[PDB]
């Protein structure tokens, strides 16, 4: 198989520096060029750089020239992207990818978050539901940084009707998202509904049981 | 009265440079701080820099720090914004404004700044032939930079006229449409001519449009 | 600095969170307000060999 | 630094004047001509170099 394993993402302040790695396996990147492509939440793809180690050629996206540097380590079969003078616009998920001759293979992606706000575990607040017909309920995952946080219900026992929404950045600088479930309201009197929340950056794991008014 | 008249806009190549002027009138810029605010086609306001002439303090927006420099010429009551290392993110209408000593009291007219490789180019005009109510217009395509202005019969016909916002093409030039809703009984009798004005390229054209 | 840990076992909330701080006493006020706003009020117990606070109901 | 030429247009349906810069009038010739061709203007061209202005008449 051909695999590309990325690392070196995470947090850093505006103007700070961060070095990503993309370790190649199954081939030798001297026969290959490796590309880096990023993407901000909900928007399109943007190529940022290219290196052809066997021709010593480098290329950088205009909005990146003079601040990033792409390297390749023969001995370890690893390409790097040394990012510096980082700005709040660089916050994206970065993919390393390999290229009569297309990017056939893509890495896992690694999240990069530039901002002053430091890491913070989420807060969980119940959205209490109203015998009966249809009942709605959820948990508000608020004031956490950086992304991501992932929500499950009854450790995956409840899946039908559940809608976990994308997080949104607030004026504060922290994220918040919602996860809800629509169930029959005849269940609320007896059945328990538990919101499971996971935040590895702060290694927070939480269960919030939600009960009616 | 208090007036602020800007100048120095126009074209520039990627990496090129352009220096704006905002001549102040009705006051002394030592009494006030001068700010520069821009606005991209269809988007919101963005502060970029400010100068406080009587305490010489400076501030620049992060997306502008290190590339722009704001100055003030006491004697001419004029502030400048020397923009360099310009990139496609800078293409906006730039406003000079006064804050008299909080709040920005008076604003200049605004001035077009367009960074891009494409050179200045006069527009071409193509007829949109009509056919109750009948529609017709003219497609003003492949012009650079903005703006171009369209009237009909030199403004004699205004009801039913819709001049649409320009759109950027893949080539890098703009194109827009101007249409009119008319009685189709008029087609046989009345003439309809599309008036087009592009100052950057000193082009003014009239195209007569009659049905298919 | 180093990182402290709060183990929380209340009626409705159960889990563990973290944060960094210079002294435990500073991570105490952070962990405390976290409890107050989540309506967790119980017996606090600190463990310094593990740097972990514990609120139990 | 180069020069600016000018084409005045007096056709049946199209009438006006446009611009462009160029090294030679002859380059400013191919410039204005295709502009005409694409607008379906076919007529008697007349050039004046003291004004750097072409004129196509229909």
């Amino acid at each position: 198989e051909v695999q590309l394993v990325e690392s070196g993402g995470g947090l850093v302040q505006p103007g700070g520096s961060l070095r990503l790695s993309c370790a190649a396996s199954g081939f030798n990147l001297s026969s290959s060029s490796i590309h880096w492509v990023r993407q901000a939440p909900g928007k399109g793809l943007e190529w940022v750089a290219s290196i052809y180690s066997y021709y010593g050629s480098t290329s950088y996206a205009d909005s990146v020239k003079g601040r990033f540097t792409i390297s390749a380590d023969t001995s370890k079969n690893t390409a790097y992207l040394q990012m510096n003078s980082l700005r709040a616009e660089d916050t994206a998920v970065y993919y390393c990818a390999r290229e009569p001759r297309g990017l056939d293979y893509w890495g896992q992606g690694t999240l990069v978050t530039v901002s002053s706000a430091s890491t913070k575990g989420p807060s969980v607040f119940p959205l209490a539901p109203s015998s009966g017909g249809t009942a709605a309920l959820g948990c508000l995952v608020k004031d956490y940084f950086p992304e991501p946080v992932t929500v499950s219900w009854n450790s995956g026992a409840l899946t039908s009707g559940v809608h976990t929404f994308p997080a949104v950045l607030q004026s504060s600088g922290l994220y918040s998202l919602s996860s809800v479930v629509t169930v029959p309201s005849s269940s609320l009197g007896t059945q328990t509904y538990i919101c499971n929340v996971n935040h590895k950056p702060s290694n927070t794991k939480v269960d919030k049981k939600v009960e009616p008014k | 009265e208090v007036q602020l008249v800007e100048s120095g806009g126009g074209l520039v190549q990627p990496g090129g440079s352009l220096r704006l002027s905002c001549a102040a009138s009705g006051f002394n810029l030592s009494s006030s701080s001068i700010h520069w605010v821009r606005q991209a086609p269809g988007k919101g306001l963005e502060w970029v820099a400010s100068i406080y002439s009587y305490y010489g303090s400076t501030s620049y927006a992060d997306s502008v720090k290190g590339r722009f420099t704001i100055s003030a010429d006491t004697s001419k009551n004029t502030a400048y914004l020397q923009m360099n290392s310009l990139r496609a993110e800078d293409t906006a209408v730039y406003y000079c404004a006064r804050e008299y000593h909080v709040g920005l009291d008076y604003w200049g007219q605004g001035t077009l700044v367009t960074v891009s490789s494409a050179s200045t180019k006069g527009p071409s005009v193509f007829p949109l032939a009509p056919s109750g109510t009948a529609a017709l217009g003219c497609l003003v395509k492949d012009y650079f930079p903005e703006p171009v202005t369209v009237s009909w019969n030199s403004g004699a016909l205004t009801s039913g006229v819709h001049t649409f916002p320009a759109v950027l093409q893949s080539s890098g030039l703009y194109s827009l449409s101007s249409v009119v809703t008319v009685p189709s009984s008029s087609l046989g009798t009345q003439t309809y001519i599309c008036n087009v004005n592009h100052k950057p390229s000193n082009t003014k054209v009239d195209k007569k449009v009659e049905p298919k | 600095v180093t990182t402290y840990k709060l183990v929380i076992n209340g009626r409705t909330l159960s889990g563990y969170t973290t944060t960094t701080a210079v002294d435990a006493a500073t991570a105490e006020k952070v962990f405390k307000q976290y409890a107050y706003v989540h309506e967790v009020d119980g017996e606090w117990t600190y463990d310094d060999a593990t740097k972990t606070f514990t609120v139990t109901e | 630094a180069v020069t600016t030429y000018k084409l005045v247009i007096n056709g049946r349906t199209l009438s006006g004047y446009t611009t462009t810069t160029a090294v030679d009038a002859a380059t400013a010739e191919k410039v204005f001509k295709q502009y005409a061709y694409v607008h379906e203007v076919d007529g008697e061209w007349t050039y004046d170099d003291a004004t750097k202005t072409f004129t196509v008449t229909e």
Partner: protein, 203 residues
């Protein structure tokens, strides 16, 4: 990108502006109308500017700062901006005037720029409310996307309608391969999706 909202004359509207930090009272509010320069309405959160009417109010309640129009008037349909902390601008909010729904009238124009190398097809959606309209392109009853760019007008001053210009542009080569060109439009005010069509070349 500006936010939008809808309100009729007489409605109460309160625009909020919040900044991550303490902006004391130094919050200014602006009004911008199409084409014209911005205009200052409120300064330092609550203090009114000279010439600003009766119905304009600014408040502070926490780190929260609000702009309120007590009774919206015909003149007031326009985009409003705030200013906070390094002075910063809020996104801005455009107040449109609410209006009964109006179906568009669709017009299709074949291209006349075939000597240019590219063929451009124009379909006109004229005077509809609300703004949201879906125009999709079909060529030989094959739905198309990418090849097209849209453009919308400001809300009309009298009848408060919207219309839309959409241009499908193709290389003459590809244009001279197909026969059927149509723009199908979906609108809330459309019982049925309307399709306007023509056959290439005189047909």
């Amino acid at each position: 990108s500006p936010s939008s909202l809808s309100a009729s004359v007489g409605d109460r509207v309160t625009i909020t502006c919040r900044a991550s930090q303490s902006v004391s009272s130094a919050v200014a509010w602006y009004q911008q109308k199409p084409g014209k320069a911005p205009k200052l309405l409120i300064y330092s959160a609550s203090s009114l500017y000279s010439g600003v009417p009766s119905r304009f109010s600014g408040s502070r309640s926490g780190t929260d700062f609000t702009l309120t129009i007590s009774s919206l008037q015909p003149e007031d349909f326009a985009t409003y901006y705030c200013q906070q902390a390094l002075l910063t601008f809020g996104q801005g909010t455009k107040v449109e005037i609410k209006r009964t729904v109006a179906a568009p009238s669709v017009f299709i124009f074949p291209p006349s720029d075939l000597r240019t190398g590219t063929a451009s097809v124009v379909c006109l959606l004229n005077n509809f409310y609300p703004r949201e309209a879906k125009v999709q392109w079909k060529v030989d009853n094959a739905l198309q996307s990418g090849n097209s760019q849209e453009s919308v007008t400001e809300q009309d001053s009298k009848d408060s309608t919207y219309s839309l210009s959409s241009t499908l542009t193709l290389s003459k080569a590809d244009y001279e391969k197909h026969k059927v060109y149509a723009c199908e439009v979906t609108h809330q005010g459309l019982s049925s999706p309307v399709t306007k069509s023509f056959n290439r070349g005189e047909c």
